[PDB]
Subunit: 193 residues, 3 copies
C-alpha cells in the first residue's frame, strides 16, 4: 500500500492515475487523473499539502515536500525528472524539471519552461514562462525553440500513455532466470511501431 | 520490515525513534531515541558501522554508507536533507546537510554548520563549527547569523515532533478516490495553530 | 517481489546476482551473474532495454532509464555509485560512476574511466578510456594513475563479495531495542581481517 495517513489525513488518488506500489504518499497529497507516480517517489504531505494536477508525472526517487502549512503544486502536464526534489514550490503547466534538480521553497516555474538536469532553483525565485534555465544555482539562459517545446510535449505524452500501460498491465512477477528466443522484449512495446 | 541483518549483524533501533516502513536499515546501524528516518532512506551498514544519535533526522531517499570498517556518525540533532548522501563522514551536533548534497569519506562537519543544497564536501575535508559552506566542491563561505541558527533549530524541532506524530498516528490506508468537504486536510495539522 | 512486468515483458535475473528486495526491476531488464543491485535502485525498462553485465553493481536509490526503444548498458564490473542516474547511455567495462552523477542519453564512458561525484555527462558525449572526468557539466581532466585504477578495482571486488554475502546471509529481522556487549557488530565482518 503506497498511501499512509498522518493525524487522520488521507491521500486522495484519482482512479485514473497510476501510483507505483513502491512509491509513498503521506498525508495531504492529492493526485488527479492521468498522473504517473514512479518507483520510490516520496510525496510527503506531513507538513503541508501537495497537489499533482492532471497528466503530470513524478519519476523515480523524486521527493516532494514542503515546510509547515506550505502548498506544493505541480500543474497539468508537469514533468518531474528522475531524482528531482520539489520543496514548497509551484511548477507551472507543462514544465519540465530536469533530473536530479532541486526547486526550493516559494520558487515558481512559468509554463512550458525547462529546468536543466542537476540544477538548483533558489528559494523565492520566479522563473518566467517558455525559457530554459540551468545551473546550480540556476539562472534563465534563453527562450525555448518551438522544436524544444514540441519535443518536451511528446515526452510528456509518452508518460501519459505509460500511466495507462501500467494501469493495464503492470504486475509483480517472478523474474526469468535466463533469456530465451521466445521471450517478449522491449521490441514488443508499442513504441517499436 | 525495514531491518535486515548481514553476517548475523542486526540493526539496533530505539523504541522512541520512528523508522518509516519503507526505509532500509542493513547490518550495524544504531538508531537512538527521537530520530526520524524517512521514506526510502537507506542506512546501509554492510561495510562499516552507522550511528545516528538522538533527535537527528534522515530524510527521503537519503543514503548513509561507508567503506570497509568505517564509522559513519550523525550526532545529536543532525538534520540530513532530502536525497543527501553521507559516506564515511562525521556530521557534528545540530548540523544541517542541505538537500541532494554529498559528504565524502573522512570529512567532518563542525557543530551547528549548514551545508547548502546540491553541495559536495570533498574527502577528508574538515569544516569548522557555526559556518555556512556551499558549492560543488564546497568551501566555507561565512559564519552563520544568530537568526540562521535559530531558524535551523526550529526546523529540527519540527522533525522531533514529526517522529512523535508518526509513532502516534502514521498508518497504511486506502486512499480516498476524490476530495470531499469533510475530509481532514493539512489545515488539521497542529502546525496550523 | 522486486520484479514487475509491463506489456508482458518480464525481467531476467541470474540466480547468481543479488537484487535487494526493495529494488524495483520493470520490464526488459537483464541482470547477469555476480551483480549487486542495492536498496531502492530503480531499473526501469518500460521504454527500452537495460542490460547489466556480470560483476557490476548498482547502488542505493540509483535510477537506470531511457527513452523509447533505447538500450542502456552497464558493462562488466561497472560500478554505479549511490544515487547516480543512468539515462540511455553506455557504461564501459570497469567504469566508476561517482555518487549522485547523471549520465545522459547516448553518452558513452570508455573502459576503466572514473566520473567524479555530482557530475553531469551531457547527451551524446563520448568520454575516452582510462581518464578522470568531473564537473557539471563534466569534462575530461586527466588520465588515471595506476594506483587509482587498482583502488577502483579493489572497490568493485568488495561489491562482488558483497553480492555473495547478501545471497548467503541477508535476511529480514526485527531490530534489537538496545546495544549489548555480546551482539555481533561491524567488527565481525570479514573486512575486519
Ligand atoms: Ca540525487
Ligand atoms: Zn522538506
Ligand atoms: Zn558506498
Ligand atoms: Zn527517463
Amino acid at each position: 500500500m503506497p498511501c499512509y495517513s498522518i493525524d487522520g489525513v488521507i491521500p486522495v488518488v484519482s482512479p485514473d492515475a497510476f501510483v507505483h506500489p513502491t512509491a509513498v504518499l503521506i498525508g495531504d497529497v492529492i493526485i488527479e487523473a492521468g498522473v504517473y507516480v514512479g518507483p520510490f517517489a516520496s510525496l510527503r504531505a506531513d507538513f503541508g499539502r501537495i497537489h499533482i494536477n492532471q497528466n503530470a508525472n513524478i519519476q523515480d526517487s523524486c521527493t516532494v515536500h514542503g515546510f509547515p502549512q506550505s502548498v506544493t503544486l505541480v500543474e497539468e502536464m508537469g514533468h518531474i525528472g528522475h531524482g528531482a526534489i520539489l520543496h514548497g514550490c509551484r511548477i507551472g503547466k507543462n514544465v519540465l524539471v530536469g533530473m536530479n534538480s532541486v526547486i526550493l521553497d516559494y520558487a515558481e516555474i512559468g509554463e512550458n519552461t525547462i529546468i536543466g538536469a542537476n540544477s538548483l532553483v533558489k528559494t523565492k525565485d520566479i522563473i518566467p514562462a517558455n525559457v530554459l534555465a540551468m545551473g546550480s544555482p540556476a539562472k534563465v539562459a534563453r527562450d525555448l525553440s518551438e522544436q524544444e517545446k514540441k519535443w518536451k510535449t511528446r515526452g510528456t505524452q509518452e508518460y501519459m500513455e505509460l500511466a495507462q500501460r501500467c494501469l493495464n498491465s503492470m504486475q509483480e512477477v517472478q523474474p526469468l532466470s535466463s533469456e530465451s528466443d521466445d521471450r517478449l522484449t522491449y521490441k514488443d512495446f508499442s513504441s517499436s511501431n
